[PDB]
Each structure stands twice: as structure tokens, then as C-alpha cells.
């Protein structure tokens, strides 16, 4: 009855989980379209909503719910298995039903997250431009010790140009690209100097409203693999700093090719969590 999405062992999260580290006590905020809190495979401990007319524990789009499931679907006898199934999960709603958000809404969510003591923030969202306030927000979150992860973008490549979106592009944020179950880069994955690591992003099955499970493709889906990993690292080495966590992830990554399309490569949690 429980399905193991291929991304889990592809990043070796399963080997870490078997060590006894599952993210217990680590706080992760999912900055997204909200989360279907009543899903039986998810346990949402709190959150906030910065979108008018929608509470934070409903997901009318599904995206938030799916991203969250990759970070933390419960390890049990049903549904799927998250990368860090015991993490304390918060839903922070910054995107509307249609999957879009405003700058001030996103910034508010980052700030909330920093203020409320999150350890890791996941932002499967992004655009062609940033804002100064957005930059301030992210830089400040990192400086205070939160690991900040974002999807690089689903723009593919074109010639020698950078298709890395913001906030991923900021240097205090990890930009994650997508690979498929064969470990190959997916075509839609953005490219650029800032790309940092890769994770599973094509054909990712996860939680999905209402009470079901579905497969989506996107750097959006690769991002939470990284957030979940950081969370595992922290549960095994609580003394680490954000940048140390960041460093472990990119240094032990599996090389796949040039950094412009693959950054340092595919994350390897077992290696990173040593």
C-alpha cells in the first residue's frame, strides 16, 4: 500500500532514513499555493496565508500539496513517502489558485518564515524578475541561518543564455535543476551560471488534492527534494550552519556534466549527511 517515488532512492534518501534520521523536529516552510491539510498522507502543523480570501490550509490548485508531499508525505502504509517524513511542516500561502503570486506576497511569506523560526524554506516558484525587497528577504533569511531553496525555472536552454529565474538566481538561494529517473537532465530545466544542484523533477508522483496522488513535471518538483535533504542533514547534524548544509549538498553531488546545465550534479544525501 505505500508507494516509493523513484526520486527517494535516486537521491539516496532512503539510506539516510534507514540510519534513523527522518527530519524529526526540523521546521520546513513550503511557500506555495497552500496545502490540502486534510490529506491523510500529510501532517501540517501551522502556516500563514498571504493571498486574499484563501486560508493557508486549503489548496485549490494542487501544486502546493504536491510539493509538500515530496518533502514530507508520512511514512506509513498508504500513499507515498516523503524525503523527510518526520519534519514539522508549515504551509505558507503565497500563490493564488492559478499558481501565481505577487512580489509583496512572496516577500511577506519569506519574512514570516524567518520570523517564525523556520529551518528551511522551499520556494517552487519564480519569475523573470526579482525585487529589491525580495533580495533583501532571502539574504536576510540565509544570514539568519535558514536554508533557502528554490526551483531554477522551466525554461530550458537557448544557446548561451541564462534562463535561471528569481529568487533562485540570488546567491543566497540554492537553484535546483531537474533530472528524470534515468538521471538525465530534463529538457525543460533551466540553465545558467547560477544553477547549483539537480534533483528528480520529471514524472514525480506525490500527494495531490483531494486525498489523491499524481504525477507532475517541473523544477518545482525537484526543489523539495533538496529542501527535504537539507532537513535530513539537520536532523542528523543539528549543529550545522545553513551554509555548511548548503556546502555538503553541492560538494558531494554526483557529477553529470557541465555546470551550466547541471550545476555540481545530482544530490546525494547519504554522502552529504555523512
Ligand X SMILES: *C(=O)N[C@H](Cc1ccccc1)NC(=O)[C@@H]1CCCN1C(=O)[C@H](C)NC(=O)OC(C)(C)C
Enumerate binding residues for ligand X (CB under 6 A). 99-100, 124-127, 151, 153-154, 165, 168, 218-220
Rg (C-alpha) for the chain, rounded Å, is 16
158 is catalytic: no
- Smallest separation, CB 196 to Na ion (Å): 4
Cell for 248?
555538503
Q: Binding residue per annotation — 168?
A: yes
Q: Which does 175 bind (CB under 5 to 8 A by kind): ligand X, Ca ion, Na ion, none?
A: Na ion
Catalytic residue among 172, 220, 223, 235: 220
Q: What is the DSSP letter of 181?
A: T
* Residue 23 · residue 72 · CB < 8 Å: yes
Question: From the centroid of its chain, how far is CA 141?
Answer: 16
Q: Which residues between 167 and 186 bind Na ion (CB under 5 A)?
A: 175
Cell for 79?
500513499
Q: Which is nearer to ligand X, 74 or 123 (CB)?
A: 123
The yes or no reply on residue 79 touching Ca ion (CB under 5 A) is: yes
97 is catalytic: no
Encoded one letter per residue, x for contact with Ca ion by CB under 5 A and - for no contact, window 25-54 reads ----------------xx------------
Q: Binding residue per annotation — 74?
A: yes
Q: Binding residue per annotation — 215?
A: no
Q: Which does 220 bind (CB under 5 to 8 A by kind): ligand X, Ca ion, Na ion, none?
A: ligand X
Q: Which is nearer to ligand X, 2 or 98 (CB)?
A: 98
Q: Binding residue per annotation — 182?
A: no
What pairs with residue 32 in β-bridges? 93
* Residue 34 · residue 59 · CB < 8 Å: yes
Q: Which does 153 bind (CB under 5 to 8 A by kind): Ca ion, ligand X, Na ion, none?
A: ligand X
In sequence order, the 6+-apart residues with CB closer than 8 A to the CB of 273 are 16, 19, 21, 229, 232, 233, 236, 237, 248
**Residue 6 to residues 9, 83, 182, 220: CA-CA distances in angstroms?**
6, 11, 10, 16
- Smallest separation, CB 154 to ligand X (Å): 5
Q: Binding residue per annotation — 65?
A: no
CA separation for the pair 271, 274 (Å, rounded): 5
* Residue 90 · residue 30 · CB < 8 Å: yes
225 is catalytic: no
- Smallest separation, CB 153 to ligand X (Å): 4
Which one, of 53, 143, 148, lies nearest residue 109 by Cα? Answer: 148
Task: Indicate the annotated binding residues.
Answer: 2, 41, 74, 76, 78, 80, 168, 170, 173
Positions annotated as catalytic residues are: 32, 63, 220
**Residues engaged in binding Ca ion (CB under 5 A):** 2, 41-42, 73-74, 76, 79
Amino acid at each position: 500500500a505505500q508507494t516509493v517515488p523513484y526520486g527517494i532512492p535516486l537521491i539516496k534518501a532512503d539510506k539516510v532514513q534507514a540510519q534513523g534520521f527522518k527530519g524529526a523536529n526540523v521546521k520546513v516552510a513550503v511557500l506555495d499555493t497552500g496545502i490540502q491539510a486534510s490529506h491523510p498522507d500529510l501532517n501540517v502543523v501551522g502556516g500563514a496565508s498571504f493571498v486574499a480570501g484563501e486560508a493557508y490550509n486549503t489548496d485549490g490548485n494542487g501544486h502546493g500539496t504536491h510539493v509538500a508531499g515530496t518533502v514530507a508525505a508520512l511514512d506509513n502504509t498508504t500513499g507515498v513517502l516523503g524525503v523527510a517524513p518526520s519534519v514539522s511542516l508549515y504551509a505558507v500561502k503565497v500563490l493564488n489558485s492559478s499558481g501565481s503570486g505577487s512580489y509583496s506576497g512572496i516577500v511577506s511569506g519569506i519574512e514570516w518564515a524567518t520570523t517564525n523560526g523556520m529551518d528551511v524554506i522551499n520556494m517552487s516558484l519564480g519569475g523573470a524578475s526579482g525585487s529589491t525587497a525580495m533580495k533583501q528577504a532571502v539574504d536576510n533569511a540565509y544570514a539568519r541561518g535558514v536554508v533557502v531553496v528554490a526551483a531554477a525555472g522551466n525554461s530550458g536552454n537557448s544557446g548561451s543564455t541564462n534562463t535561471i529565474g528569481y529568487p533562485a538566481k540570488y546567491d543566497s538561494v540554492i537553484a535546483v535543476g531537474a533530472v528524470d529517473s534515468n538521471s538525465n537532465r530534463a529538457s525543460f530545466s533551466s540553465v545558467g551560471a547560477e544553477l547549483e544542484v539537480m534533483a528528480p523533477g520529471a514524472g514525480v508522483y506525490s500527494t495531490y488534492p483531494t486525498n489523491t496522488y499524481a504525477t507532475l513535471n517541473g523544477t518545482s518538483m525537484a526543489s523539495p527534494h533538496v529542501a527535504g535533504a537539507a532537513a535530513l542533514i539537520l536532523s542528523k547534524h543539528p549543529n550545522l550552519s545553513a551554509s555548511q548544509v548548503r556546502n555538503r549538498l553541492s560538494s558531494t553531488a554526483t557529477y553529470l556534466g557541465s555546470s551550466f546545465y547541471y550545476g555540481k550534479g545530482l544530490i546525494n544525501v547519504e554522502a552529504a549527511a555523512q
